[PDB]
Design a protein around this nucleic acid. Structure first.
Ligand SMILES: [Mg+2]
Ligand SMILES: [Mg+2]
Ligand SMILES: [Mg+2]
Ligand SMILES: [Mg+2]
Ligand SMILES: [Mg+2]
Ligand SMILES: [Mg+2]
Ligand SMILES: [Mg+2]
Ligand SMILES: [Mg+2]
Ligand SMILES: [Mg+2]
Ligand SMILES: [Mg+2]
Ligand SMILES: [Mg+2]
Ligand SMILES: [Mg+2]
Ligand SMILES: [Mg+2]
Ligand SMILES: [Mg+2]
Ligand SMILES: [Mg+2]
Ligand SMILES: [Mg+2]
Ligand SMILES: [Mg+2]
Ligand SMILES: [Mg+2]
Ligand SMILES: [Mg+2]
Ligand SMILES: [Mg+2]
Ligand SMILES: [Mg+2]
Ligand SMILES: [Mg+2]
Ligand SMILES: [Mg+2]
Ligand SMILES: [Mg+2]
Ligand SMILES: [Mg+2]
Ligand SMILES: [Mg+2]
Ligand SMILES: [Mg+2]
Ligand SMILES: [Mg+2]
Ligand SMILES: [Mg+2]
Ligand SMILES: [Mg+2]
Ligand SMILES: [Mg+2]
Ligand SMILES: [Zn+2]
Lengths: 211, 156, 224
RNA sequence: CGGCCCCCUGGACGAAGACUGACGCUCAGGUGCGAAAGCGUGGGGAGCAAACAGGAUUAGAUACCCUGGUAGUCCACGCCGUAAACGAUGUCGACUUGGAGGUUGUGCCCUUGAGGCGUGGCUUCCGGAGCUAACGCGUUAAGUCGACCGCCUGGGGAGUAC
RNA sequence: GUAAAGCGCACGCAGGCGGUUUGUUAAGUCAGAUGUGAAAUCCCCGGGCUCAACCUGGGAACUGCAUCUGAUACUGGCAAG
C-alpha cells in the first residue's frame, strides 16, 4: 500500500512551506525554475556543509535564501567570505538582488534530511547498512525524539535480489495530522546501483494549529 | 564483577500463514566467580536482543553454591531430562575438565578444579540445567553437621 | 479481637461440607447443618500473631496492600486502606500486578499525566469531544489504579480477603517473597498464606471486623 | 464365557475361631491350555458367505454395488499353535497425599424398615508428590525398593536363507 | 506403555533367592602371620653417560594363590523353636 507524503499532507497544518513568496500566473513558472536552479546550485556547492533546508522568500524586488545547516562555519567560511561568494552567484542565477541568511540546526540527529544523507554517505563508503540504520535510530532516540523509523531499500550489501529493511523505535503516528513528523529521503549511488533511504522522525503532537 | 558468558545461539523457526519467521535464542550464564551462578535463556527476532534478554534472566534466579577452595565438596550427580552430569572435586592445578556447556557454568560459578563428564543428551540447555541442579545439591561439612546435629569435627 | 468479639460477628461461619479443601481439617471445629464451622480457638491467636507482624511491618515504615475483589466488600476494603494511609486493590485483580511491576508503573504514569494535564490546561486546545474522551480515560485509569497510584514501589505486606478467590495475587507474592496475610475460608488452600487467618470471607460484618482491627493496629504501628 | 432347567465340577471372597509351623517366591529346558482361519475322518446344513456364476458401474473393475452361490460357519474325534493373542505395560512382596463412582461381602447402632458410623475383595474415572523425551502414569504406578525370569542393541536385507 | 525390546497364558523340575528366635558350626566373609607371586618392564627416591632418550642402585608394586592362627555381625550348614 502506497503512503501519502507525510510532509506534504501536513502543509499548512503543522508544517510550513519551503517557499513563501507570492506571484501571479505570468511569473509563477519563472519563479519555480529560478528557485529550483538556486536550490540545485546550493545543494551541489554545499554537499559537505551538512545543509538541511533551503527556504526561499521573494520580497518586492529581491530574493532571500535561508540555509538551515548543521555546520554554519563551513557555509560562511573564514572572515565571512564564502557566503558572499555564493550570494553573488545566487543573485546571478535569480537575476535580482539576493540575500543569504544562515540558521543553525542545533541537533542534527533530529533532522530527517541530515540523518538520511549521513546514512547514504555511510552506505556509499561501504558500511554495513544495518549498523548505520541502528546507530542513526539510537542516536535520534537518545536525543529526545519520541519516535523514528528508518527504511533502507534496494540491493543491500550488493546482492542480486533487492529488498527493503526498515526499523522503527518509539511512536511514529503517520495518520495523525496533528503530529509533527519530519520526513526526508536520500539516495546513495553504490557500485551496485542506487539505494534509497527514508527517515521519519516524530517530535510530539502540536496543539493549536500552525501557531 | 559478575562475569558473563554466552553458551549457545540457536536459530529457531515458525511458519505463519505466508512464510517462515526466524527467531534467535540465546543461552547464557552469569556468576560472581565465588559461588553464585545463574543461567538465562532469551528469545528475540535478532541475536543481540536475545543475548541481552538472556543476560537479564541469568542475573535473576542466581543460586548460591557451597564451594571448597575453588573446587567441589564431594562427587555429585545432576540429572535433567536426558542429560546426566557427573562432577567430582580435584586437586589444585587440575583445571576445568568438562564439556563446553559444563565448562562455562563451572568457570563462571567460581570452581577451578573439577573433573566432570556428561552422559546422555548433550543439549546445552538441559546440560546447563543438569549441572546447576548438581551444584545446588552439593552439601558442605558445616551444613551437614548442623543438619545431623553433630559438630564439623565429629563428621570429618 | 476476642473470641466473643468474633463469634457475634459470625467469624465461625463457613462454606458447605460439600465444598471444602483438604489442608483445612486442623482449623475446622466441626459441621452443623452440612455447614463447615471454623474454630475460633485457632482463629484468634493466629489473627493476633498476624497483627503483631503487621504492626511490626507498619512500624518499620511498611507499605501495606489490602486485597479483595468481592463486589460487596470492595468499598469496605478501600475505606479500610484509606483509614490507615495504605494501598489497596478493590477492583478485579490484574495478573502481573506485582510480577509485571514495570508495566503498572507506565499505567500509573499515564494516570498521573492525564490528571496533571487537566489541572495544567490545554484541554481547551483539545476538541470538546477529545477533552471528554481524555476525562473518560482518566476515570477508567482511576477505577483501575485508584489504590496503588501512590504505592511507589512493590509493597511490604499483603492483606487478602478470600485467598482462594485471589489466588493469582498470592502466587505472585510467593514468587516475590512478599508475605501474605489472608482470611482463609474452609474452601481455600492455606499453603500460600504465611500468616493464615481461617475465617469467613463473604459476610460483610466479619470482613469489616478484620479490616477495622487490622487498620487500628496499623495506625498503632505507625504512631510509635 | 450370555435363554431357562437338572447333573458333575474349578476358583475367588467374607465373618469368627481352630490347626500346620517357612511348608515360600521365581523359573532355562519340559508339560499343558490357547480366538479365527485352515487340515483329516464322519455327520449336519436354516441363515450367512471366500471362491465362483451372472447383472451392472467404470478409461479399466479381475474391486466396491446387485442377484445367486460352494467350501466354510454347526456337531464328534484328532491335527494345527498362530493374532494389533493389547493395558502394545512379566510374576511376587513391601512402602508412599487425595477425591468421585460401580460391584460384592460384613460389623455395630438407632423405634425399625429407612437411615447413620465402620471394615474387607474386585473394579471404573479425575488428580497430588514423584516419575517420564513428551504424551502421559499416578496406591490396580509408568512412583520408592527387593527376588527371579523373558527380551533389546541403527534402518533395510529379514523373522528371510541354511 | 508408544522410539529396538515383556514369552499369548499358566503349571512346574534343575537353578537363583528366602520371614523370625536361640544354640552350634566356621564354609563364604574378615583380621593377623608365614610361604610364594623369576628378572626385566610400569611406578617412587637416587646415581651414571655434557642433557635427554638410554643405562643403573634401593624401594614400592606384583591387586593373586596356598597354609596356619584368630574374629562371629552378616550369608551358608546343622539342631531346636
Ligand atoms: Mg493513494
Ligand atoms: Mg545420546
Ligand atoms: Mg505349635
Ligand atoms: Mg519355556
Ligand atoms: Mg474353527
Ligand atoms: Mg483347502
Ligand atoms: Mg472340517
Ligand atoms: Mg465333511
Ligand atoms: Mg446371499
Ligand atoms: Mg507373536
Ligand atoms: Mg482379545
Ligand atoms: Mg507383544
Ligand atoms: Mg505389585
Ligand atoms: Mg477379574
Ligand atoms: Mg490419572
Ligand atoms: Mg513398580
Ligand atoms: Mg518408561
Ligand atoms: Mg541391522
Ligand atoms: Mg520362517
Ligand atoms: Mg516398539
Ligand atoms: Mg502379556
Ligand atoms: Mg508361576
Ligand atoms: Mg528349587
Ligand atoms: Mg535368612
Ligand atoms: Mg538355599
Ligand atoms: Mg586372609
Ligand atoms: Mg618382578
Ligand atoms: Mg643425571
Ligand atoms: Mg630400575
Ligand atoms: Mg618389596
Ligand atoms: Mg545361622
Ligand atoms: Zn469463602
Amino acid at each position: 500500500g502506497q503512503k501519502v507524503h507525510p510532509n506534504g499532507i501536513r502543509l499548512g497544518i503543522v508544517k510550513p512551506w519551503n517557499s513563501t513568496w507570492f506571484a501571479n500566473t505570468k511569473e509563477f513558472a519563472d519563479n519555480l525554475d529560478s528557485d529550483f536552479k538556486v536550490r540545485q546550485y546550493l545543494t551541489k556547492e554545499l554537499a559537505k556543509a551538512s545543509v538541511s533546508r533551503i527556504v526561499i522568500e521573494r520580497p518586492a524586488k529581491s530574493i532571500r535564501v535561508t540555509i538551515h545547516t548543521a555546520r554554519p562555519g563551513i557555509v560562511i567560511g573564514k572572515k565571512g567570505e564564502d557566503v558572499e561568494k555564493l550570494r553573488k552567484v545566487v543573485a546571478d542565477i535569480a537575476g535580482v538582488p539576493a540575500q543569504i541568511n544562515i540558521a543553525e540546526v542545533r541537533k542534527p540527529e533530529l533532522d530527517a534530511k541530515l540523518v538520511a544523507d549521513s546514512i547514504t554517505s555511510q552506505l556509499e563508503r561501504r558500511v554495513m547498512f544495518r549498523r548505520a540504520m541502528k546507530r542513526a535510530v539510537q542516536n535520534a532516540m537518545r536525543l529526545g525524539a519520541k519516535g523514528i523509523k528508518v527504511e533502507v531499500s534496494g540491493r543491500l550489501g550488493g546482492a542480486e535480489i533487492a529488498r527493503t529493511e526498515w526499523y522503527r523505535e518509539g511512536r511514529v503516528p503517520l495518520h495523525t495530522l496533528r503530529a509533527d513528523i519530519d520526513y526526508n529521503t536520500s539516495e546513495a549511488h553504490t557500485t551496485y546501483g542506487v539505494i534509497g533511504v527514508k527517515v521519519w522522525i516524530f517530535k510530539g503532537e502540536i496543539l493549536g494549529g500552525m501557531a | 564483577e559478575l562475569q558473563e558468558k554466552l553458551i549457545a545461539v540457536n536459530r529457531v523457526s515458525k511458519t505463519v500463514k505466508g512464510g517462515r519467521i526466524f527467531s534467535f535464542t540465546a543461552l547464557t550464564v552469569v556468576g560472581d566467580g565465588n559461588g553464585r551462578v545463574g543461567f538465562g535463556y532469551g528469545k528475540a527476532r535478532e541475536v543481540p536482543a536475545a543475548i541481552q534478554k538472556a543476560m537479564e534472566k541469568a542475573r535473576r534466579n542466581m543460586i548460591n553454591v557451597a564451594l571448597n577452595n575453588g573446587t567441589l565438596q564431594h562427587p555429585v550427580k545432576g540429572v535433567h531430562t536426558g542429560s546426566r552430569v557427573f562432577m567430582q572435586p580435584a586437586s589444585e592445578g587440575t583445571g576445568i575438565i568438562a564439556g563446553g556447556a559444563m565448562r562455562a557454568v563451572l568457570e563462571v560459578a567460581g570452581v577451578h578444579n573439577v573433573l566432570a563428564k556428561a552422559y546422555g543428551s548433550t543439549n546445552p540447555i538441559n546440560v546447563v540445567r543438569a549441572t546447576i541442579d548438581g551444584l545446588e545439591n552439593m552439601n558442605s561439612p558445616e551444613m551437614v553437621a548442623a543438619k545431623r546435629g553433630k559438630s564439623v569435627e565429629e563428621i570429618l | 479481637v476476642s473470641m466473643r468479639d468474633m463469634l457475634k460477628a459470625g467469624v465461625h461461619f463457613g462454606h458447605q461440607t460439600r465444598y471444602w479443601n483438604p489442608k483445612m481439617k486442623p482449623f475446622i471445629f466441626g459441621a452443623r447443618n452440612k455447614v463447615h464451622i471454623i474454630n475460633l480457638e485457632k482463629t484468634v491467636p493466629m489473627f493476633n500473631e498476624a497483627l503483631a507482624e503487621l504492626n511490626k511491618i507498619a512500624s518499620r515504615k511498611g507499605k501495606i496492600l489490602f486485597v479483595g475483589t468481592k463486589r460487596a466488600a470492595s468499598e469496605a476494603v478501600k475505606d479500610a486502606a484509606l483509614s490507615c494511609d495504605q494501598f489497596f486493590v478493590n477492583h478485579r485483580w490484574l495478573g502481573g500486578m506485582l510480577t509485571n511491576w514495570k508495566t503498572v508503573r507506565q499505567s500509573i504514569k499515564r494516570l498521573k499525566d492525564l490528571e496533571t494535564q487537566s489541572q495544567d490546561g490545554t484541554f481547551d486546545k483539545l476538541t470538546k469531544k477529545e477533552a471528554l474522551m481524555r476525562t473518560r480515560e482518566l476515570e477508567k485509569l482511576e477505577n483501575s489504579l485508584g489504590g496503588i497510584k501512590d504505592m511507589g514501589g512493590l509493597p511490604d505486606a499483603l492483606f487478602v480477603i478470600d485467598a482462594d478467590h485471589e489466588h493469582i495475587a498470592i502466587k505472585e507474592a510467593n514468587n516475590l517473597g512478599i508475605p501474605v496475610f489472608a482470611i482463609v475460608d474452609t474452601n481455600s488452600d492455606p499453603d500460600g498464606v504465611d500468616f493464615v487467618i481461617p475465617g469467613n470471607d463473604d459476610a460483610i460484618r466479619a470482613v469489616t471486623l478484620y479490616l477495622g482491627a487490622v487498620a487500628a493496629t496499623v495506625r498503632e504501628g505507625r504512631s510509635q
